[PDB]
Specification:
Enzyme class (chains B, F): isomerase
CATH superfamily of chain A: RbsD-like domain
Strand order of the largest sheet of chain A: 2-5-1-6-3-4
Number of helices of chain A: 4
Helix content of chain A: 25-40%
Structural class of chain A: alpha/beta
Subunit structure (chains B, F): Homodecamer.
Pfam families (chains B, F): RbsD_FucU
Largest sheet of chain A: 6 strands, mixed
Oligomer: homodecamer
Order of helices and strands of chain A: HEEHEHEHEE
Bound molecules: alpha-L-fucopyranose
Keywords (chains B, F): Carbohydrate metabolism, Cytoplasm, Fucose metabolism, Isomerase
Number of domains of chain A: 1
Function (chains B, F): Involved in the anomeric conversion of L-fucose.
CATH architecture of chain A: 3-Layer(aba) Sandwich
């Protein structure tokens, strides 16, 4: 734990976040995500909701302006998604407003998770609660 | 995650709990515990309370009936404990929850140095550290 | 071991099952499978039957409903497969609710698929074609 | 697996048994033993009985004749030990020739001794005091 | 780098600072300190002043209040401390509130304590006796 | 060592043989084989002949009946083989010893690169390298 | 620290510069460079300006005369460089020729994936990345 | 394999032998020795007799003159030892004669094997075929 | 060090030389070669001349006779080789019999081959183009 | 290699010397020293004379002024040193004081177990071992 920094961010994630450079991507997945088979280093955040890390990390993480900074997974046809999830993610990320969030199909998302800098799997239970953040040029 | 098992328990902690044998000790510490300098493997559980992990693990973890299975830290001289902590931990570990005994910071740290693992949590209370001793799984 | 969880599941396997997410695949091979050269981590369960493991894991493992969750190996040219195997695998998998249909794929495609699995658990099953792949779903 | 060798013996255990020399000790513990904190390398054999392993290993493992080759744990104050355990352990060990007498030592001295063992194989034996230590001899 | 947190703190140091608990100790040494032979993990901070790093971490690092949290090295017989080093350090450490009195211990006593430190950050401070140890407290 | 098992087989090779599955390939090379630059794990057996290891392993190692289980190296153009080698290897691997097929140095090395392991021996003969493919243990 | 050698160079960087041979390329990046994602080993030099290292390094590092020895990043189209960055760099390097080649952001990343090492500095100036190519030490 | 050097010495043993300095000790044990539980690095020489390595290594290994260079294990009371074993060891080591060989009790031998530089376990089947060599000042 | 074998050969190099098989290649480069970026394991031999190391290993290293076993680097346009380097190398390599003709290939071709070498020994040879590659043959 | 720095110093030795701080001790041993048995990290410098390294190292390495900075091995009782060894060493070091302390063979080993590193050279001279203690870099 450290002062002025959300105690919800583990020491290892703190390191990962700092090591990230312009353009690096990090995923905060829901609890159902196959994080461990993607390839990048995985960090567990089992007792937390994605919205928890988002609000904890946003004052530290500059979002990329050179590319879509926020990406989520699109529900497969014949499946159900929750409208509220994306709503609080935006609220958690609004320091003030945050860029629009774009959804790509689940496979496209995995494909990109495979090249990500790291993956943080949380306890988010809602379906399709996975979100990718692309880092910008930290001022 | 997994069905019928608390998702608050990370897979690595699930492995640790399963590997532990009779007499093995694990510590669930508060956020201020010097967990990483004790020696045993450390598992972070930052967003959770000690009482959260205690209740999640108890239906899987039989407590030792051959020796004191629950050990907490005695307040250092010129300092006092928060009454709310121990009572909350007992509640979480309830068969009845065995009695809890206190031992000075020296003896607690000496045992922490030799514990099977240390799970550091987001528990903010002072003296929120607790040592559990595994018994024989029935 | 732990209470409420089958003792047949090793600590490492419990970790593996918990780490797996939606779509991840895990193989429970018979004793003849070339598990160690496939690529993924290998957990040995020598002396144990695949069916005994399936029955122990099924109450915690959600099978994928987004795609066929069960894949077995088709017999190779000239071989006859023992119907007793798939019969007791489905039974073990039907512990709480009947299990989905099992599909069969060419031995080469099975290996190519084993090369991408999350993990491989090699058991004591001595019958040929006793390998079965499981695909995890979304834990309800 | 391999021909002429029990399939119940994992590859790692076969290596371990072959590496052991005269006087080296290996423990086959029950499922309750604190094997992972003792120190020596641990091989898991979850779901398997100690007696089933002993019967599989005895034809390859020479028991030491220079010192007591079999050590078991004495029950702790208040506990009763099941005579059925030591009974089937000796039977399994008597596969080709009757096995030596088994000695019992205090739980603390057993652990102190486990800390020096070559390896520890934790099995699926669920009975208490199902731990047994074997000391290798000179392969004739 | 990150926003909010000073970029003078390398990602590895940030992780270290966060893992430290109440009572844990960290050394920010001058360029002449035998950092690598003490025992704990070392983080190089060549080119940076100790006072640069103290200012960077003070907003995140609560000092121990259960014991003297600031310790520097006493000058060895024949040498004499440069009070300006302490001034700079004191000002960096007093950016939020007056820092506790800074205690000075003998060279060898300092090394002994370093052997048990959580980590050691060797900087570019070229002034003699530019070493300082910080003890962590209960984070508010 | 171990009773009923050849002491010529090191514990590590004993582990390797046991881990190998159907279709897995292992090479027993002569002393001049570039074993350490192929890729797979290498096990030294310097004082032994390939025929020594072949005979020791055969009572434990069932050979593949689904594909060519024995592969040797074809002599490079402008070079010739020593007749005594292949015949000695067949003798060592005798159920009858399946037929042996030759493949150029390129195809042999390509497979060596992907083999499960390589056991380099003290076999001094030229082209004394042989690749065994494991079958289904009965 | 060592006499005659700039104390700004960490022992690890000293080792890296010494291990580099003719043609090897090293990058001293700004704080925003995605160094850890490229592939080569990374040396953190947080808080230091690129120009500080260049000045510290140049007396020991011979620049390649067989190929352009200095490469920088061209500004993203439509954007412009801060002329002070390169002026500061040219001075630190004590720079007849050689000139500084400028390659596009991604072309720069491509070449950085194959570099000997990447030293990420505390340089906050936009496009402060510079790649140096070692020559033959006189 | 290398020219002029016994092909019976594996590459790793070659390295160990060379890394050894004045006073370092190395054990060539029989096949019954508990080499792997002693502590030092172990090298397998399964198809060889101790006498094989001895004759292969002696032209490379200078024996210590500052201390007893050759030590073997004494048979426990109530056990049998082979007179020929020590005989050929001496013959193998005689390049020309080799120092006397002294026997210490089995436990004393293990105790010393625990601090040795390395242990080479061979296929020597004879009981008490273990021998320790102490390296001298290589000329 | 050892007797019989030249003490100029570090224990790690001796091991490497012995593990090499027919066709394996090793580079003894000059002090300016980019040894560490090629890919293979590197052994430092600072201070020693390439000709010093060639004399040391020739008695133990059979050259390949199935292909040109000796390869050096051609001078880059603008440069010119110092024939005395080759003389020294030739004499060291001819201590037991006339060494095969020494072939010279382009700089980049040499690097390409180095990426696939068994190992690289970078020495203190400060003359340009002091690099030489050896291909191992069937040891008599 | 690096300009201004002796090419005799390997990159790893350069790193080690740079990491050493005030009071740390480094040993440059002769070829007969049991370096790998002592405990500290070992850097091979086969073929090089101790005096060659000392000459290469001294311009970068400040000797301790707070404690005797040079220690050597006293000859085994009844034996004698070759005066040329130390004369050669004193010259390489460009050596008012300090004097060279001589400790018995085993006392030397004891201190070598706690040294920062051991560089084993090709020095064949009896008792060519020398321990240097680092001071405060000016
Ligand atoms: C079908 C999808 O599968 C994975 O991507 C999960 O992380 C999602 O939440 C969803 O269940
Ligand atoms: C004095 C004690 O120090 C550590 O053990 C903390 O984890 C406790 O909560 C308490 O503050
Ligand atoms: C031909 C097949 O080969 C492997 O896949 C074995 O695991 C099967 O049981 C069967 O023998
Ligand atoms: C009291 C004893 O504790 C451990 O040694 C267990 O392995 C035993 O079975 C018994 O429960
Ligand atoms: C004598 C002392 O030695 C070390 O502790 C240095 O870090 C100090 O600055 C001082 O030079
Ligand atoms: C040309 C071939 O090269 C290697 O494969 C050797 O192992 C063979 O015996 C033969 O010499
Ligand atoms: C757009 C570019 O992104 C990275 O390459 C940074 O290192 C540059 O300075 C610039 O910000
Ligand atoms: C009793 C002794 O035990 C070990 O020391 C063996 O290596 C000996 O050969 C002998 O059998
Ligand atoms: C131009 C060449 O570059 C490298 O290959 C050096 O090793 C050569 O000696 C030469 O300087
Ligand atoms: C007797 C001594 O043994 C070692 O310390 C050698 O390094 C010395 O040079 C001497 O030979």
């Amino acid at each position: 734990m450290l002062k002025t920094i959300s105690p919800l961010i583990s020491p290892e994630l703190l390191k990962v976040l700092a090591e990230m450079g312009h353009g690096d991507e990090i995923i905060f997945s829901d609890a159902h995500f196959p994080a461990h088979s993607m390839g990048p280093q995985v960090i567990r955040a089992d007792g937390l909701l994605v919205s928890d890390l988002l609000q904890a990390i946003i004052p530290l993480f500059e979002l990329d302006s050179y590319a879509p900074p926020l990406v989520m997974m699109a529900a497969v046809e014949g499946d159900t998604l929750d409208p509220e999830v994306e709503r609080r993610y935006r609220n958690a990320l609004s320091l003030a407003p945050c860029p629009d969030i774009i959804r790509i199909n689940r496979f496209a998302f995995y494909e990109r998770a495979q090249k990500a800098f790291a993956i943080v799997i949380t306890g988010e239970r809602a379906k399709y609660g996975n979100i990718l953040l692309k880092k910008g040029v930290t001022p």
